[PDB]
Design a protein around this nucleic acid. Structure first.
Lengths: 696, 295, 688
RNA sequence: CUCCUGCUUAUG
RNA sequence: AGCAGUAGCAAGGAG
């Protein structure tokens, strides 16, 4: 007897039989070695999709520049993806866009964006993902990168008194006018660097390999920028964020009701002979065919009547994307015929060591050479991952609101790289005409629809952001399994955080109740297996159940114990919002309740109930700056006992209010309190000597 | 400490030049990045690292003087619970945690825990006194809404909540006393008679006041009535293909200017050394003036 | 929001008046708030005590007002007294002091603003400058003792506290004393160079984008794009070219799982609570499973290396006989678990050049291709067949239930839990959890030391909790820095079936001896296999218990959709009287299927989720994407919606690109082709 | 190919 | 040998 699981799809829908075909239970794919060939395929493929040869030499940068707009050499295979944007066509799509809703659209949206840039603190730059710090040329979190950047500003010339977005950006442009910048290297030697290397370094974007990406056989490289490009990108993402929130055919911030309203609305506007065919499309090479010169053209049109500050402030990040550098990873390796000795060639010596590469490496390397730096590469038309995502959706709304003038047209919905198009027409050759006109407008503007991964039907049978919609029923996003148990902090914050994740996946996704009870019992079992705690009735005898089994006769009511201390489960599906202690403190023994909840404990001293919070030991394998900075943190937190809650206002001085605060509470505790001359005069002498020592 | 050694360590740890280039000559903003600065990058597998930590013998960093004041070195059969390695912090085993949980001293703190977590004990009482019934097994569906889900009776808007705790516990560096604050100042006058003398930590006080008053606004899929008592039980009451419900039921003072040589008398004696005097007031983060009472 | 906070600290109606003043001023954004504060400043000056006797007011307000009536009211107040201008329009006129009244409010120390105003007018007007900080620094004529000064310092400390709330410091700037970007030297040559090709500078591009109107020659370029297209859609009702996939016709794929599933044999004993560590289970099975009758011939049946496995098995046999699990260093463990077998990583500091001696280069190949396996059906049908040992997976207890749907979820958990604990898939999950768990803790607690870790389980036999023993595992001195690292495990397995050089391709099968089996005394084979796990793969196999979530999610979607469309609580009989079509036979396929119960369906679902938990590679991921595409085509066949595709050549190039050697991928491709054969019997979009 | 080196007691 | 797939691990140093 042969056996086949997919026969389950012979009498059911695909809304229930699609989690069967997601392998989200096994191990995610990882990358290995270097991330050089992936980036060379991205850059060389980006130049290979530009369809041009017209070069303009640069007088600023020592590398050539290839133009990307309005320089087309029309090859016969136009189905191959092109990277050329017609600016008159897309500005015609901008006027055709704003003429559908309102007249003062870009002025009102640009005033809403302009209202909320001047009221932004620059610490918002530190609430991001991992960035590329150029001090040591590594990948660091954003707080350390802004730490070394602000330390470079205060180290080179003058101090920093900005505390805003605009004066920080003007400080970056002031660094672009500076002739020599001094920063710290290796034990802290202060080195200097000139002017051209600062421009070559401020436009540096690091490329690595994307780890943990489900769904590709071949790996794709991700790129993270520096810090001196980020806040202008925050400006553009706020502007385009307000534009996408104002629109009606976008789904970046409900994604379910809008398709109901466009299916129900556009099916209600048919003739007696017209009908509708929907096409699921998925744009391929979306990160290599969105040039920032089109962003420079459109963002000079959105800001035509906005201000003088915003008109100049929304045309800066597209230029830095127009002259960006691409890192090369860390090189490659070479070995002999015996395969024993293997030298490592870095990305620096790749120019000299050209004679030790494969056929594919020399095919990707000989067609990338005249755009190479000594250590980096040059790109002027790419837009990689980790960049503008809220602004290409505006292009997607522009292509899906086109007017060609019968009475045949289209509509739909756009996402990051998924689009669902609804066509309304009369006959099938006119369907060829309208679909080929959609490929015409997307192909002329610069959006390459993939032909292999696109299809369609007459009713709703489409794919959009991995949610398969049938004719009547609706599937959900396939849930990530390993996000259930990644708390790993405490005996108290592993189970309640698991119930919070089961709660938010129960409310957000479907998560049927028996599946939720099963997942709660599995996370309970790995909780009991991690911390080695079992119920008392089981015969488990390890280094913690001996004490619990020995002292079980001292506890009167047996269900008053905790799960982490030798008790069974009392939380349920209807008890996920209540932790175990608050559910069980009405049944504990008073000796047990007084015994466990002692704040005089050797484990807590040195957002749930804290009674088991221990700290594990650190590892055994920049350490002065955290010493001094955390001395400032413990000091300023010690002076102002309520300062981690409120934002620390006041920027005239810190230590003046500290000294007047120790005089304030020393005099406050003194005058109807202590009353003794040596303590008040002693603290007075220490504060005065600290002020004379500090201020001089 | 008791605010007698803070000036000594303030004197000895401000002897550096670069600390003077930072304090009062540098960036006050970067304290907001000094609080979140540490080199703990991502911790991409924390539960795996906890399984490796609990696989050793002594993973725990515990205090010394309390457990050598009360505890025992080795148990009745060879269970090691101590170390002699190092600052003064001694490694230990979770068998010492359960030994503290079964053979430790007891301190009466029923009213403390049963006054800090009053919102969640109120959730336990409101979950205990409800009733359910039959199910439906029918189709259901509705769009997503923005619902505040907690049965509060004050309903601030996430901006007067920081400002309330700051204008209750330590009113000096707090915030403005604003135009949306006069009724909230009647609330301060009603709440200064509550949180004056307590043994609760101030961050825990900001936790309980920041949680017992705040309607938590969320973006959740709702259906049926949107009454705020049955909205925190949204996960239990209905799903996508099923539905079940059968529920039938005093400083009224002022300041003037900065000039006169005021007597060095702070806010602690602001009432008895009050009227008819130009008495100076030190307002918090650095804004200190000289005060005249205005009728 | 400007309007929300501006309605918080500043008054209600004054917003509209100040906004009208900005509507009479120009394209300016921030000054609203300043003018609004200024207006309430005048409202705090000139409201309550405005010279009530002679009710015509002392403060003639002609600054914040409509820009039509200041000249008329100026010519209505000054027509009796008559004054002289002071080179500027006066803010507020006065008749008690018979002078002007200037109002200005500033942030800084008020010295420089008052000296620049001293450069403008001197002190011949009546200057009133109020600071947010609290400095009444103005002209010598003053207010007497009134609460106008007290309330205006209360109001500017008020508004200044609002400035310190939302970080509004570069927002109260008067235009004469924010809207200018720092025009640098090198960025202005950077933006002018990054313009498109028909443009010269950013100024010409900005004026042309400000002066752009669309035309109707857009459709000339659009139809000119349609003309040079050469693309037609491809239907399915006339050209149903959904052809079967190219499974490679090459050598059959080997058994590539890390352990043994179906060819396993074990020894059972009653389990004791005290002897519970894996070394103590290894020792107790050294007395229980007799190694004294474990005689291995020095000649293997097949394989490559025979002497090293014999000396290594004897070395670990007498090593366990001395009751210590640490192999002493000899040539056998120096050859099997790699010690000294790595490439010399030499940096680019010295190269020691030579005339064509050690000529170094690089080379990459890819992956080897294999064929369709035939050994997978019997392991699938064994994998859902019941074994009499009872529960295998250590599942936790049931919480106490209310009168809610917890009887429904308790019923589903107890029935599906009662069905999956007895199958052999639960035995393999217990094998992976206990074995890779113990190997994982040995990979943490002792690097650099070769351990001897058994391969075992624990299950209930005749009610009594027993444990088993499947193999002997050897760790390979893992130094796991990153998520990879690939430590080498040497596995000695116990088997009770005769080997096969087609299936067991990666083994070095010996012969061990005799085993009595009750129902005469059959043979006993020992297997040998060197392999390698990884650090991330230890967490993803050591936590393979969480396969019940997609299985029970699928079954509960079936049942909740069924009672969702039947509108009646029919659950306990629907879980019994509902068929599921699986397992078409070998000789015939055309509408000859096996309708089974739903409990065998959740058996097969936990089987396929477990095999998804084992064989996760790149190829299974990309193949699962493409089979979701063909599943959408088959759903397009189930309703005859007349779907269409644009290019059916490169699609099969991408599917046939991502099928190389993974046996689960080849098996699901073959069963997908047989799904197309069964679907060809009813719908017409496929081939034979 | 040859020559020299190491602690972390693991419990469904 | 082996893991693994478009390149790395399978200890390090000296000759």
């Amino acid at each position: 007897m042969e056996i086949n699981p997919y026969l389950l799809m012979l009498n059911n829908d695909i809304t229930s039989m699609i989690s069967l075909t997601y392998p989200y239970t096994g191990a995610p794919p990882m990358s290995h070695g270097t991330s050089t060939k992936y980036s060379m395929e991205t850059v060389s493929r980006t130049y290979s999709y530009s369809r041009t040869k017209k070069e303009v030499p640069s007088g600023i940068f020592p590398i050539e520049r290839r133009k990307f707009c309005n320089t087309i050499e029309d090859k016969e295979n136009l189905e191959k993806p092109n990277g050329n944007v017609d600016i008159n066509f897309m500005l015609s799509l901008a006027e055709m866009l704003e003429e559908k809703m309102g007249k003062g659209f870009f002025k009102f949206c640009a005033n809403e964006a302009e209202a909320e840039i001047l009221k932004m603190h620059f610490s918002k730059l530190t609430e991001g993902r991992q960035t590329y710090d150029w001090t040591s040329e590594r990948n660091m979190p954003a707080a350390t990168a802004l730490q070394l950047t602000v330390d470079a500003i205060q180290e080179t010339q003058g101090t920093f008194k900005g505390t805003t977005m605009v004066e920080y950006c003007n400080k970056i442009l002031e660094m672009m006018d500076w002739p020599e910048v001094k920063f710290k290297k290796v034990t802290l030697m202060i080195t200097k660097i000139g002017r051209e290397e600062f421009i070559k370094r401020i436009c540096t974007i690091n490329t690595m390999a994307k780890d943990g990406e489900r769904g590709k056989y071949k790996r794709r490289a991700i790129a993270t920028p520096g810090m001196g490009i980020r806040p202008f990108s925050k400006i553009v993402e706020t502007l385009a964020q307000k534009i996408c929130e104002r629109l009606a055919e976008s789904g970046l911030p409900e994604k379910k009701a809008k398709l109901k309203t466009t299916v129900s609305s556009t099916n209600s506007k048919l003739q007696e002979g017209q009908f509708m065919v929907n096409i699921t499309g998925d744009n391929s090479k979306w990160n290599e065919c969105q040039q920032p010169e089109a962003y420079l053209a459109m963002l000079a049109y959105i800001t035509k009547d906005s201000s003088n500050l915003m008109k100049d402030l929304c045309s800066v990040a597209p230029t830095l994307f127009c002259n960006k550098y691409v890192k090369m990873g860390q090189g490659f390796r070479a070995k002999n015929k015996r395969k024993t000795k293997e030298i490592v060639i870095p990305a620096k010596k790749m120019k000299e060591r050209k004679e030790l590469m494969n056929a594919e490496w020399r095919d990707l390397f000989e067609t990338i050479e005249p755009y190479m730096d000594g250590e980096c590469c040059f790109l002027g038309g790419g837009m990689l991952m980790g960049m503008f995502n809220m602004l290409s959706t505006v292009f997607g709304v522009m292509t899906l609101n086109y007017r060609e003038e019968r009475n045949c047209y289209w509509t739909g919905l756009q996402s990051s790289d998924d689009f669902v198009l609804f066509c309304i027409s009369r006959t099938w050759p006119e369907m060829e005409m309208t679909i080929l006109k959609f490929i015409a407008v997307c192909k002329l503007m610069g959006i390459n629809m993939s032909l292999e991964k696109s299809y369609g039907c007459l009713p709703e049978l489409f794919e959009f952001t991995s949610m398969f919609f049938s004719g009547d029923f609706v599937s959900n996003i396939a849930l990530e399994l390993p996000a259930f148990t990644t708390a790993g902090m405490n005996e108290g914050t592993d189970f309640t955080a698991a119930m919070s994740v089961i709660r938010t996946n129960m409310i957000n996704n479907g998560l049927s109740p028996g599946t939720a009870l099963m997942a709660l019992r599995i996370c309970l079992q790995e909780f009991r297996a991690t911390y080695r705690v079992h119920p008392y009735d089981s015969g488990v005898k390890n280094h913690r159940m001996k004490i619990i089994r020995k002292f079980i006769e001292t506890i009167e009511n047996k269900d008053g114990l905790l799960i982490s201390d030798g008790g069974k489960l009392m939380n349920n599906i209807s008890s996920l919002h209540i932790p175990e202690e608050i559910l069980k403190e009405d049944l504990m023994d008073p000796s047990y309740r007084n015994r466990v909840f002692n704040p005089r404990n050797p484990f807590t001293q040195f957002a749930v109930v804290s009674t088991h919070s221990f700290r594990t030991r650190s590892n055994r394998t920049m350490a002065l700056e955290e010493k001094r900075y955390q001395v400032v943190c413990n000091m300023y937190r010690s002076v102002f006992e309520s300062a981690d809650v409120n934002t620390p206002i006041g920027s005239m001085s810190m230590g003046e209010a500290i000294e007047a605060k120790i005089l304030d509470r020393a005099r406050t505790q003194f005058e109807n309190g202590i009353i003794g001359g040596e303590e008040y005069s002693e603290i007075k002498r220490l504060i005065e000597d600290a002020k004379r020592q500090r201020l001089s | 400490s008791l605010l007698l050694t803070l000036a000594k360590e303030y004197a000895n740890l401000t002897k550096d030049k670069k600390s003077c280039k930072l304090l009062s000559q540098g960036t006050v903003s970067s304290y907001t990045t000094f609080k979140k600065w540490t080199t703990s990058r991502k911790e991409k597998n924390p539960s795996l690292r906890m399984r490796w930590a609990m696989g050793s013998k002594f993973p725990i960093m515990a205090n010394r003087e309390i457990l050598e004041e009360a505890g025992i070195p080795e148990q009745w059969e060879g269970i090691d619970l101590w170390s002699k390695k190092d600052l003064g912090m001694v490694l230990a085993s979770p068998a010492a945690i359960t030994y503290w949980n079964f053979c430790g001293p007891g301190v009466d703190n029923s009213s403390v825990i049963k006054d800090v977590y009053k919102a969640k004990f109120m959730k336990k009482e409101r979950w205990r006194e409800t009733l359910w019934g039959p199910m439906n097994f029918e189709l259901v569906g509705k769009q997503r809404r923005v619902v505040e889900t907690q049965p509060v009776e004050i309903k601030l808007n996430q901006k007067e909540i920081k400002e309330l705790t700051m204008w209750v516990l330590f009113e000096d560096e707090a915030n403005l006393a604003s135009k949306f604050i006069q009724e909230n100042f009647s609330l301060v006058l009603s709440l200064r008679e509550l949180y004056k003398g307590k043994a609760v930590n101030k961050d825990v006080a900001a936790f309980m006041i920041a949680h017992q008053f705040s309607p938590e606004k969320r973006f959740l899929p709702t259906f049926g009535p949107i009454r705020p008592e049955r909205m925190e039980l949204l996960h239990c009451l209905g799903g996508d293909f099923w539905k079940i419900e059968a529920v039938t039921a005093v400083e009224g003072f002022q300041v003037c200017e900065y000039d006169p040589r005021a007597p060095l008398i702070p806010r602690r004696d602001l009432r008895l050394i009050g009227f008819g005097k130009k008495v100076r007031v030190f307002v918090g983060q650095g804004q200190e003036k000289t005060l005249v009472r205005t009728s | 929001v400007i309007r929300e906070i501006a309605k918080r600290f500043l008054e209600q109606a004054t917003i509209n008046i100040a906004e009208e003043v900005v509507r009479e001023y120009g394209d300016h954004e921030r000054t609203m708030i300043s003018v609004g504060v200024h207006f309430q400043a005048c409202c705090l000056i000139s409201d309550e005590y405005t010279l009530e006797d002679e009710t015509t007011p002392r403060y003639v307000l002609l600054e914040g007002l409509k820009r039509q009536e200041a000249i008329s009211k100026q010519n209505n107040i000054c027509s009796t007294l008559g004054l002289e201008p002071l080179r500027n329009l006066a803010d507020i006129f006065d008749r008690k002091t018979r002078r002007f009244l200037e109002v200005g409010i500033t942030k800084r120390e008020s010295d420089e603003y008052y000296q620049e105003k001293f450069n403008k007018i001197g002190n011949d007007m009546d200057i009133h400058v109020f600071t947010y900080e609290g400095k009444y620094f103005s002209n010598n004529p003053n207010g007497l003792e009134d609460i106008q000064k007290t309330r205006i310092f209360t109001f500017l400390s008020f508004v200044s506290d609002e400035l310190r709330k939302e970080n509004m410091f570069t927002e109260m700037y008067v235009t004469e004393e924010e809207l200018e970007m720092y025009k640098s030297k090198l960025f202005i040559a950077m933006r002018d160079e990054s313009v498109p090709l028909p443009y010269i500078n950013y100024e010409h591009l900005r004026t042309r984008c400000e002066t752009f109107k669309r035309n109707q020659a857009e459709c000339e370029a659009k139809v000119a794009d349609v003309a040079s297209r050469l693309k037609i859609k491809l239907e399915h009702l006339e050209e149903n070219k959904l052809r079967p996939l190219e499974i490679p016709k090459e050598k059959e794929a080997p058994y590539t799982h890390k352990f043994l599933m179906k060819d396993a044999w074990f020894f059972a004993k009653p389990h004791d609570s005290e002897r519970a560590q894996p070394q103590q289970i290894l020792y107790d099975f050294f007395e229980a499973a007799n190694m004294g009758f474990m005689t291995t011939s020095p000649k293997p049946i097949f394989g490559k290396q025979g002497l090293m496995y014999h000396s290594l098995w004897g070395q670990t046999k007498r090593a366990i006989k001395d009751k210590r699990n640490e192999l002493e260093p000899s040539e056998q463990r120096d050859f099997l678990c790699g010690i000294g077998r790595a490439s010399k990583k030499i940096q680019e500091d010295k190269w020691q050049e030579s005339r064509e001696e050690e000529f170094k280069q690089e080379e990459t190949k890819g992956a080897a291709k294999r064929g369709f396996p035939t050994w997978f059906n019997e392991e699938w049908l064994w994998a859902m067949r019941d074994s009499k040992i009872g529960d295998w997976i250590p599942m936790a207890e049931m919480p106490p239930c209310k009168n809610e749907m917890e009887d429904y979820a308790k019923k589903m958990c107890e029935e599906l839990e009662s069905k999956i604990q007895g199958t052999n898939c639960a035995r393999e999950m217990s094998k992976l959890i206990h074995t890779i768990g113990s190997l994982h803790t040995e990979c943490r607690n002792f690097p650099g030391k070769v351990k001897i870790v058994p391969i075992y389980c624990r299950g209930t036999l005749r009610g009594e909790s027993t444990d088993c023993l499947f193999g002997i595992a050897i760790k390979g001195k893992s130094h796991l820095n990153k998520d990879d690292g690939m430590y080498t495990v040497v596995t000695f397995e116990f088997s009770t079936e005769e080997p096969n050089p087609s299936k067991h391709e990666k083994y070095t099968v010996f012969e061990a001896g005799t085993v009595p089996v009750e129902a005469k005394e059959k043979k006993l084979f020992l297997y040998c296999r060197t392999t390698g796990m990884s650090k991330l793969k230890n967490d993803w196999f050591s936590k393979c218990r969480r396969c019940l979530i997609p299985t029970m999610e699928t079954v509960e979607q079936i049942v909740l959709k069924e009672c969702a469309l039947k509108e009646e609580n029919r659950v306990s009989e629907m879980l019994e009287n509902k068929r599921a079509w699986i397992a078409h036979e070998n000789g015939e396929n055309l509408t000859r299927l096996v309708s089974t119960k739903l409990k065998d369906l959740c058996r097969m679902l936990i089987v396929t989720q477990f095999y998804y938990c084992i064989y996760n590679d790149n190829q299974l991921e990309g193949f699962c994407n493409e089979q979701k595409k063909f599943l959408m085509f088959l759903q397009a066949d189930k309703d005859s919606k007349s779907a269409f595709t644009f290019n059916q050549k490169g699609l099969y190039e991408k599917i046939e690109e991502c099928i190389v050697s993974n046996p689960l991928c080849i098996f699901l491709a073959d069963r997908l082709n047989k799904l197309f054969l069964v679907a060809k019997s009813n719908g017409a979009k496929y081939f034979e």
